[PDB]
């Protein structure tokens, strides 16, 4: 059955601000994108130097 499948538990892997299932997103997505792109921007700065 196509209704018999469901996504398994990802609570070992997902971040703390997206762990709560009963809280909607688009409140912390900017913070997560900012953190990951901050890592990307800082290593780009080091490589450019």
């Amino acid at each position: 059955s196509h209704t018999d499948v469901k996504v398994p538990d990802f609570s070992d892997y997902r971040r703390a601000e997206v762990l709560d299932s009963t809280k909607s997103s688009k409140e912390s997505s900017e913070a997560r994108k900012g953190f990951s792109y901050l890592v990307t921007a800082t290593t780009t700065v080091g490589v450019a130097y």
């Binding site: 900017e30 913070a31 953190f35 921007a41």
Partner: protein, 60 residues
């Protein structure tokens, strides 16, 4: 309050051109800070041995 990475994403990291401008300006400020700090570490580990520490007896 909105977080510091949230303001960083909404104001600088959203577009790609502002991302590149932030990378360039951060590279300028970071090469200034890193070069001064690493140089200062270098004379703090090697005090009294470099030429700059001993160009007072003979420079006049």
């Amino acid at each position: 309050s909105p977080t510091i990475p949230s303001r960083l994403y909404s104001l600088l990291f959203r577009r790609t051109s502002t991302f590149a401008l932030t990378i360039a300006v951060g590279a300028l400020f970071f090469e200034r800070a890193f070069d001064q700090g690493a140089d200062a570490i270098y004379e703090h580990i090697n005090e009294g041995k470099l030429w700059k520490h001993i160009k007072h007896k003979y420079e006049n």
